[PDB]
Coordinates of N, CA and C in Angstrom, one line a residue:
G1 N -10.5 5.3 9.5 CA -11.7 6.1 8.5 C -10.3 5.7 7.3
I2 N -9.5 6.3 7.0 CA -8.9 5.7 6.5 C -6.7 5.9 6.8
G3 N -7.1 5.6 7.9 CA -5.5 5.7 8.8 C -5.3 4.0 9.0
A4 N -6.3 3.8 9.9 CA -5.9 1.9 10.3 C -5.9 1.0 9.4
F5 N -6.9 1.4 8.6 CA -7.1 0.5 7.4 C -6.6 0.8 6.4
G6 N -5.6 2.2 6.0 CA -4.9 2.5 5.2 C -3.0 1.8 5.6
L7 N -2.9 1.5 7.2 CA -2.0 1.0 7.3 C -1.9 0.0 6.5
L8 N -2.8 -0.5 6.0 CA -2.7 -2.1 5.6 C -1.9 -2.0 4.3
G9 N -1.9 -0.9 3.6 CA -1.2 -1.1 2.5 C -0.2 0.4 2.4
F10 N 0.3 0.8 3.2 CA 0.8 2.2 3.6 C 1.6 2.2 3.3
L11 N 2.8 1.6 3.4 CA 4.2 1.3 2.8 C 3.6 0.7 0.8
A12 N 3.0 0.0 1.2 CA 2.5 -0.4 -0.1 C 2.4 0.6 -1.5
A13 N 2.1 1.6 -1.0 CA 1.1 2.5 -1.2 C 2.4 3.2 -2.0
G14 N 3.5 3.4 -1.0 CA 5.3 4.0 -1.5 C 4.9 3.5 -2.5
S15 N 5.3 2.9 -2.7 CA 5.7 2.3 -4.5 C 4.5 2.1 -5.4
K16 N 3.3 1.8 -5.2 CA 2.6 2.3 -6.4 C 2.1 3.5 -7.0
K17 N 3.3 4.6 -5.7 CA 3.1 5.9 -6.3 C 4.5 5.9 -6.7
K18 N 11.9 3.9 -5.0 CA 13.2 4.3 -5.8 C 14.4 3.9 -5.1
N19 N 15.2 4.7 -4.6 CA 16.4 3.9 -4.0 C 16.6 2.7 -3.8
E20 N 17.6 2.4 -3.7 CA 17.9 0.7 -3.8 C 18.1 0.1 -1.3
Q21 N 18.3 1.7 -1.1 CA 17.8 1.2 0.1 C 16.4 0.3 0.4
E22 N 16.1 1.3 0.4 CA 14.5 -0.1 0.1 C 14.6 -1.2 0.3
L23 N 14.8 -1.3 -1.4 CA 14.6 -2.4 -1.7 C 15.8 -3.6 -0.6
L24 N 17.0 -3.3 -0.2 CA 17.3 -4.0 0.9 C 16.5 -3.8 2.1
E25 N 15.9 -2.8 2.5 CA 15.2 -2.8 3.3 C 14.1 -4.4 3.7
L26 N 13.4 -4.2 2.0 CA 12.3 -5.4 2.5 C 13.3 -6.6 2.1
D27 N 14.3 -6.9 1.4 CA 15.1 -7.8 1.3 C 15.3 -8.3 2.3
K28 N 15.6 -7.1 4.3 CA 15.8 -7.8 5.1 C 14.5 -8.8 5.7
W29 N 13.7 -8.8 5.0 CA 12.3 -9.7 5.1 C 12.6 -10.8 5.7
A30 N 13.9 -11.6 5.2 CA 13.9 -12.9 5.7 C 15.0 -12.5 7.3
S31 N 16.0 -11.5 7.5 CA 16.8 -10.8 8.4 C 15.6 -11.0 9.3
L32 N 14.3 -10.5 9.2 CA 13.4 -11.0 10.0 C 13.2 -12.0 10.5
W33 N 13.0 -12.9 10.2 CA 13.3 -14.2 11.3 C 14.6 -15.4 11.0
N34 N 14.8 -15.4 9.5 CA 16.0 -15.9 9.4 C 16.2 -17.0 10.0

């Protein structure tokens, strides 16, 4: 309903609505594959 289809932009929502930790969290994007 609004859970599975919401997971498509759940995290992004958190931003749509702080700490740098999160930034570095996404900064690891590369670290993912790297």
